[PDB]
Amino acid sequence: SRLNRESVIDAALELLNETGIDGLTTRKLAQKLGIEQPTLYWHVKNKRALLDALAVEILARHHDYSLPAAGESWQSFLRNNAMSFRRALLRYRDGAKVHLGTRPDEKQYDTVETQLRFMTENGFSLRDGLYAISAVSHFTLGAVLEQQEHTAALTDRPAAPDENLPPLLREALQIMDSDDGEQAFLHGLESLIRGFEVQLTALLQIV
């Protein structure tokens, strides 16, 4: 089949949904594209290069709330940015593990620069704007990684000692399972953003 950049990525994302990150191999990708491995090699050197391209392409295609809307509050921006980030990472199997394995490229540095300019124009110190951006990223990535690695584990581990659970824990585990963690995520997000606001709002006052 065609081996333009776009088609190679389309097949690689299809393979990633089939195999997950550990099972994705250039051999399987060649077979899916109907080509020999040395043909694929001309197009993409190794699994590392493929995963780096997939991470960038997952965000470029599906993380579309990178930049604040005209006159958007910093609160609303961080919220929409986090939801778009989570949604992009959840779109492919082990998508967060794909994102984790890559260094930010020139385009990701430009995006953080725009975000940091925005935060500082909204009254954040440089340090505090970057800590807010990093905290939202760390929280969102951890939430998604815990959700996808729980699903990956479900292959080799059944569910564990039911009979044994103490009662708050048992009820808690039932609540988190009702919705695969969207509620936990959205609640935690509001907490994080409000915390940033209380800190910013103090200015130089002890808080």
Ligand X SMILES: C[NH+](C)c1cc(NC(=O)CNC(C)(C)C)c(O)c2c1C[C@H]1C[C@H]3[C@H]([NH+](C)C)C(O)=C(C(N)=O)C(=O)[C@@]3(O)C(O)=C1C2=O
Known binding site for tetracycline: residues? 63, 81
Rounded Cα distance, 179 and 154, in Å: 17
- Binding to Mg ion (CB under 5 A) within 47-106 occurs at 102
| Cβ count near 203 (within 10 Å) | 8
Residue indicated by tokens 């991470």: 55
Rounded Cα distance, 67 and 80, in Å: 9
- Among 35, 40, 51, 59, the residue binding ligand X under the rule CB under 6 A is 59
Annotated binding site: 63, 81, 99
Rounded Cα distance, 186 and 140, in Å: 10
Rounded Cα distance, 51 and 200, in Å: 38
Is 148 an interacting residue with respect to ligand X (CB under 6 A)?
Answer: no
Q: In terms of CB distance, is 39 or 125 closer to ligand X? A: 125
Shortest Cβ 59–Mg ion spacing (Å):
9
Of the candidates 20, 105, 14, the one whose C-alpha atom is nearest the C-alpha of residue 59 is: 105
Query: Crossing angle for the helix pair 5-23 and 26-33, nearest 10 degrees?
Result: 140
Part in contact with ligand X (CB under 6 A); list of ranges 25-33, 128-136, 189-197, 198-206: 128-136
- Binding to ligand X (CB under 6 A) within 9-38 occurs at none
Shortest Cβ 15–ligand X spacing (Å):
23
Nearest to ligand X by Cβ — which residue? Answer: 176
Q: Which two tokens stand for residue 48?
A: 């590392």
Interface positions with Mg ion (CB under 5 A) = 102
Interface positions with Cl ion (CB under 5 A) = 2-6, 26, 46-47
Interface positions with ligand X (CB under 6 A) = 59, 63, 66, 81, 85, 102-104, 108, 111-112, 130, 133-134, 136-137, 147, 150, 169, 172-173, 176-177, 180-181
